[PDB]
């Protein structure tokens, strides 16, 4: 039962930044394996006995402890050094992973550019309607996004969804879908998506008439 | 020398049981104990257990004792794991790892397995071309869209113009709208690129031999 703290949780870092990460058991351990984990896909061996790189991984990183602390560095932050690390336990067991540390990578802000789009005739059809706003390319996550009907607020039928931090360019999108009835959309004219951002001191908001 | 082989998703009724292989495929199958480790959507790893092929020995994690059972074929080097009376905490990505000597490090890891415990049944998806309303997009010329309501089994494919076109592309992450799911996908083209053009959407769920087309037609 020996449990694996990992700190920090969470972190980002702008490239060119050292970078530690730890990882301290409830008892001593032998050596500690690392892992490395992109969003999708399966975890890669990344340093095994606490200091030897696995195969590929670059210079830039490197681990040590003893007893119950261990850690892993790096010595300057890069755009493909962003993912989830686990440190590994397996000198006792059962065999405990750590709790996780999520790297980030940080970059220059950058504002969303937002889209609204009306319910489609084919779904109207059927009798039901759906809204649709699109917050993209936005950096600092912490967005937040309201809907208003003919000028009142609505928190209600509404569905968010987030994308990772995009690879090439380091942003983030965001999804708004707002479903009624074909009789509550009629039974009203206005429809607002509205964005509230650090990178404005003031709403940004997007809407059309029915 | 590495090269590991899952199964497809799985998708068991609570109460069920699924029976899921990994086969080895490039090295001294009975030479390696086998790991199989369990992460639950937008969480951590935690170890089940191990098999040795070649005696068929055997440790296992104990809060997985009545629920899981290790075995393999030798003679096609794979090894299995079936686990029992499934439940919603059963749900999630299952992987097989090949151990080494000495330091004991879990060198090549499966493309990993994913399980679904419910009660559901697979429904098809509605594909809905959103089309823009005149300046109610900004910059980036213009941005289209494509809404896939209401189907069950995750598993969907989405593209644009059989995938001529993927670049300035963003498929959202599925949400579930009690027992169902719903996905969007963006497109942003230049000006002189969309009526003159032609921009399609192409979705495709797996679970119900569905493959709709829709073509983005303006207002």
């Known amino acids: 039962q020996i449990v694996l703290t990992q700190s920090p949780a969470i972190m980002s870092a702008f490239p060119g930044e050292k970078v530690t990460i730890t990882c301290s058991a409830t008892?001593?351990?032998?050596?500690m394996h690392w892992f490395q984990q992109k969003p999708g896909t399966s975890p890669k061996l990344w340093i095994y006995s606490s200091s030897n790189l696995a195969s590929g991984v670059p210079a830039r990183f490197s681990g040590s402890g003893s007893g119950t602390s261990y850690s892993l560095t790096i010595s300057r932050m890069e755009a493909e050094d962003a993912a989830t690390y686990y440190c590994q336990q397996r000198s006792s067991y059962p065999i405990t992973f750590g709790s996780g540390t999520k790297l980030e990578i940080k970059r220059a802000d950058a504002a969303p550019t937002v889209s609204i789009f009306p319910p489609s005739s084919e779904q109207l059809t059927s009798g039901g309607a759906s809204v649709v706003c699109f917050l993209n390319n936005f950096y600092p996550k912490d967005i937040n996004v309201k809907w208003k009907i003919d000028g009142s607020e609505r928190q209600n039928g509404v569905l968010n969804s987030w994308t990772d931090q995009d690879s090439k360019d380091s942003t983030y999108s965001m999804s708004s879908t707002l479903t009624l009835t074909k009789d509550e959309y009629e039974r009203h004219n206005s429809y607002t998506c509205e964005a509230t951002h650090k990178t404005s001191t003031s709403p940004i908001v997007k809407s059309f008439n029915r | 020398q590495g090269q590991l082989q899952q199964s497809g998703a799985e998708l068991v009724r609570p109460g069920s049981s699924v029976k899921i292989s990994c086969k080895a495929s490039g090295y001294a199958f009975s030479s390696f104990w086998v790991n199989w480790v369990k992460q639950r959507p937008g969480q951590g790893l935690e170890w089940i257990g191990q098999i040795y092929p070649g005696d068929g020995d055997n440790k296992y994690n104990g809060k997985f004792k009545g629920k899981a059972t290790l075995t393999a074929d030798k003679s096609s080097t794979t090894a299995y794991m079936q686990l029992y009376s499934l439940t919603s905490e059963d749900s999630a990505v299952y992987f097989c790892?090949?151990?080494?000597?000495?330091?004991?490090?879990?060198?090549?890891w499966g493309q990993g397995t994913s399980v679904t415990v419910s009660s559901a049944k697979t429904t098809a998806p509605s594909v809905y071309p959103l089309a823009p309303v005149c300046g109610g997009t900004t910059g980036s010329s213009v941005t289209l869209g494509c809404l896939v309501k209401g189907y069950f089994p995750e598993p969907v494919t989405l593209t644009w113009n059989s995938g001529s076109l993927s670049s300035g592309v963003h498929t959202f992450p599925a949400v579930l709208q009690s027992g169902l799911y719903t996905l969007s996908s963006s497109v942003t083209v230049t000006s002189s690129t969309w009526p003159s053009q032609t921009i399609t959407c192409n979705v495709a769920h797996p679970a119900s031999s569905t493959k709709v087309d829709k073509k983005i037609e303006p207002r």
């Open positions: 790892a090949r151990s080494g000597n000495y330091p004991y490090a879990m060198d090549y």
């Open positions: 008892s001593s351990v032998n050596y």
